[PDB]
Each structure stands twice: as C-alpha cells, then as structure tokens.
Design a protein around this ligand. Structure first.
Ligand SMILES: O=C(c1ccc([N+](=O)[O-])cc1[N+](=O)[O-])N1CCN(Cc2ccc(F)cc2)CC1
Ligand SMILES: [Cu+2]
Ligand SMILES: [Cu+2]
Ligand SMILES: [Cu+2]
Ligand SMILES: [Cu+2]
Lengths: 287, 287
C-alpha cells in the first residue's frame, strides 16, 4: 500500500527516464529474459493436458498469474532502483482518439512508435528499437528485433473503450464453469476478452501487433507490462466493487486453477495474490 | 543428514511399492507434469540467447540445477508419504552385468522392463506401462505411451562402467571455460558426458532410449529421477573427496551459470544447493 503505481500519462520526464533505464538494465543482466521464458512456458503448460486451458491463459488463473508475474517483475526493478514502480497503460482512454498511435506512451523517450512498413514492421524508434533491444523467438532463440503494427487487423481495428471496461465491471461472478474460453457471465473471461472476442485484453494484444500479437513472444515488448498493469488495475477495481465476491473455482476445478493451487511455473497460489494491497502496492486512482 | 537416499538394489519390496505408489499419486494430482514442464522449459532457456548452453544442460549449472530439481521432487513425494525417499540407480554396477535389462530395477514391481519391438517399443510391463501411465510430447501435448529400447544405439550400446565414474572422480576442476559441451578437464562436462561422448550421464539417456533418449521428454520415464539421483550422488562423492573445491564459474560466466545466479525456472542459485547435507538429505553410502 506504500508503492504507488501511476498512469503512464501521469508520469514525469524523470520518471519515464528512470523506468526505461531500469528495464534496459534488467535486460542487460539477463533477468528480463526469464520473464519472457516464464510466460512462454506457462502458455504451453495445459491444465489438464489435452485441454485448451493453460497456467496463464484461457482459464481462471489468468488474472492471478499475471498479477504474480508483474509483482516479481516490479521487485526486480526496485532491486536496481527502489524508487521505480510499474506504470500502467490506460488504453481505454487512448481509444477515445481516432488514432491512438498519437498517444504519449509511443513517444521516442518511452516505448517508441509504430513499426516500419519498410522493415517488415520492425520498430526503429525509441529505446527498444532494433539495435538497442534484442528479442527472442518462440523457441528461445534471437529473432532480430521488436515489431509493431497498430490496428492492421480486421478482428481488432480499434482499442477497447471505457464503456467496454465499465460493462465488464458489471459482472458479478469472477468466473464460471467450465473455467475456460466459453465461460459465460464471467468477469475473468470478459476481461480476458473471449466473449465475442477479441475484446479488452485480447484486443489490445491484437491491436499492437508484432510480438504482442502472439502469446509466447508478447513480453518481448516492454509495453506488455504496462498493458497488464492496466488489466491488473481493472481487476483490482472489480475486487473493490464486489468486495463480497471472491475467486473461482475454490475447488473441483482443474489443477492449477483452484484457489489454493500452485500456479506454474511457480508455487504461488491465487490466494497469495488475491489482495494487491497485501502485496505492497496500490494504484494511483485508489488515492 | 537424516533422509537417506538408498540404492535401488538395497530397497525392500515394500519400499519399491511405496515409491511407485507415491509417484502415481503425484501423477494423478497433476504435480508430476510440473516437473516434465520445468525440465523442458529449462532446456529452451539459453544462457545467453544464441549459444548452445541452456539453464539445465551443456553448461556449468547442469549439476546444481538437477539437484534442486530432485530436491523439489523428493519434497513433493514426502507430502504424500514422509517415509518415501528418492532412490538412485547405480547403473555403473548394472554395467558389470551380462544383461543389464535383467536388473531388478526393471522388474514389474518397480520400473517395468524393456519395450516391445512388436508395439514400436512401447513398455507393456510394470506400473508405468501403456494404459496405466500417460506421457506428453515436446510441446506439452499428450503422446502415446512410455517407450524404451535398451542399447539399440551404436553410440551407446553399453552402460557406463565404474572405471568411467572413477576416472571422472579424478578430475580436479569442477568446470572450465567456455563452460559448455567442449569444456576440457572439467568434472561437470565429464560427468555430463560430452568428453568423447556419449559417456556417463548422456550415455545412460541414449542407452535407455524412448522418451529418455530425448531431453525435453526424458522425465516422462520415472527412471529419469533414479538416474539423476545417481548423478547427484557421484557429484556428492566428488564434493566429499574434493572438499576444498567449489563451483565454477564463480563469476564472469553466462548469466544463469555463475555461483550466485538464479537457475531458471527458479530463484534457486547453485550455492543454495552446493551442500547436499545442508539440504537435509544423505546417500546411504555416506553411512
Ligand atoms: O489475439 C488474441 C486471441 C484472440 C482470440 C483467441 N481465440 O479465440 O483462441 C485467441 C487469442 N490468443 O492469441 O490467445 N490474443 C492476443 C495475443 N495474446 C497473447 C498474450 C496474451 C496475454 C499475455 F499476457 C501475453 C500474450 C493472447 C490473446
Ligand atoms: Cu500472458
Ligand atoms: Cu496479455
Ligand atoms: Cu535434464
Ligand atoms: Cu539427464
């Protein structure tokens, strides 16, 4: 509750400079690659084997998994600089624009801009451009740099709207059986974006394009953490609103999806991260 | 120093039966799959990206990684049954036999025998035969059944001998630059088996064949843990003989390979597992 997580647009020049630097330091030390691998490993860990659910996606563990994912990442950031916290990308407001690519987040001093159509949509601006930022493929091998391609998809030509977020907050149940892609009246599945998908979370990924468009390689783009910090923020809001609601399933769900099951690749359970304030951080809007 | 890890041949019928049962329970609960996944994930985590080294193999972290791997596995076993400890397969003694496939470890009450050449070398004996034991492929997706094919390879027609083990114990340096499969005068690289390979560890894998012949799917066969318990024992013996020696490199090696680097996919460092007795276990021969 002492660490404040701010909106990217509400950041100071010095703050944006310290975050980027810290990320570059984590990358240089080899720590950043662990998060790309963790995410890719979880996406291939099905619960149970044979089903389309995995440890991190298309299931109830989606939200607590990524919350633990961000928590570990933020702790690594502060090991370098204790004053640095993980910002979030409030994409629902950027959607109000006719061209979200003009947002301050895509400036050369933070995340960098859109991909270059002359270089197969390779990002050539910002601190994460090809030449300063190395990317790895689905196999853990070097891939030749970051790619982006804003709204060039038919399924996701736009970013999710504030109404879309608000409509998701209307849901009462955290999740519903069979705890997967087809869960109805489920806040989790709604926020993830499979209900008339791609929506919300899934839509943001498809909108950015490049590595962000594919599960095993999405964390290659630093904006991935800013995006999921917003998803985590939206979840935290839901938990505040429906304070009487709790996680599901509590039991009788697939192993790795229940309230007290370890989340691969970790031993962390959804219960351990159910209360974000207990984790030692808070979002600016809560103040 | 209280948990004793015994030789498979020195196990009682009741012991061999309780170990198998505990493994089957871990499989049913979905915990076993986490170890297959952990092992596969580490094999694709290169240190650094681009090199042929990975977090668990072909590098200095090879021995401490698998020790942590076995340690975690053993603790999960005891969560089910506190009387169960991880046995080890003294294959160097089985090599003295005139038919290693007739060893008691391959009996129907423990691991089961060789595969069936009429069923594509599927294993049809023991508690881990097709129909009672499900396996997954390199992608984390379900496969047919456990397979074995003893010494049908030209590179590894035999099991490694005591002479090979002793010769490996003669090495003074734990590891040498460039810390990989080509490292010379290295105990790690020697025990792993890249020196005039396949030898020792690598040879055992290729000798067993089937899933054990391929790294990402090797843990599908329960004998994987018995095999690596012997490897951990040999290392423990080496550490006992060479008590003044330590891990290498201490620093300036690839990230994930140094003495105090976290070993993907965990936060555990080689130092955390450098002393097997401090971990709370001991091998029977140390008594
Ligand atoms: O575009 C989609 C989408 C849309 C529809 C379906 N579907 O119906 O199967 C499946 C997917 N998908 O890729 O999972 N997505 C965008 C990419 N994204 C990858 C991703 C998601 C969450 C992360 F933290 C990291 C990466 C995952 C979801
Ligand atoms: Cu994800
Ligand atoms: Cu995502
Ligand atoms: Cu291994
Ligand atoms: Cu091995």
């Amino acid at each position: 509750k002492y660490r404040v997580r701010k909106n990217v647009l509400h950041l100071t020049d010095t703050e944006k400079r310290d975050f980027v630097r810290t990320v570059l330091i984590l990358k240089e030390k080899g720590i950043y690659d662990r998060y790309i691998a963790w995410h890719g490993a979880a996406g291939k860990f099905h619960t149970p084997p044979g089903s389309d659910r995995n440890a991190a996606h298309m299931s109830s563990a989606f939200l607590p998994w990524h919350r633990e994912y961000l928590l570990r990442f933020e702790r690594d950031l502060q090991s370098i600089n204790p004053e640095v916290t993980l910002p979030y990308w409030e994409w629902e407001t950027d959607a109000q624009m006719q061209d979200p690519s003009q947002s301050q987040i895509w400036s050369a001093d933070f995340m960098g801009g859109n991909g270059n159509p002359i270089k197969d949509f390779i990002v050539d601006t910002g601190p994460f451009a090809a030449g300063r930022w190395t990317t790895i493929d689905e196999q853990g091998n070097p891939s030749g740099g970051l790619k982006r391609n804003f709204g060039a998809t038919k399924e996701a030509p736009t970013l999710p709207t504030r109404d879309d977020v608000l409509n998701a907050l209307k849901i009462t149940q955290y999740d519903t059986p069979p705890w997967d892609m087809t869960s109805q009246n489920s806040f989790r599945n709604q926020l993830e974006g499979f209900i008339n998908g791609p929506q919300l979370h899934n839509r943001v990924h498809r909108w950015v394009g490049g590595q962000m468009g594919v599960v095993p390689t999405a964390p290659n783009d630093p904006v991935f953490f800013l995006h999921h910090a917003n998803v985590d923020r939206i979840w935290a809001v839901w938990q505040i609103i429906h304070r009487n609601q709790n996680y599901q399933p509590m039991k009788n769900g697939p192993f790795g999806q229940n309230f007290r099951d370890p989340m691969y690749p970790w031993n962390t359970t959804p219960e351990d991260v159910m209360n974000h304030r207990k984790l030692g951080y808070v979002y600016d809007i809560e103040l």
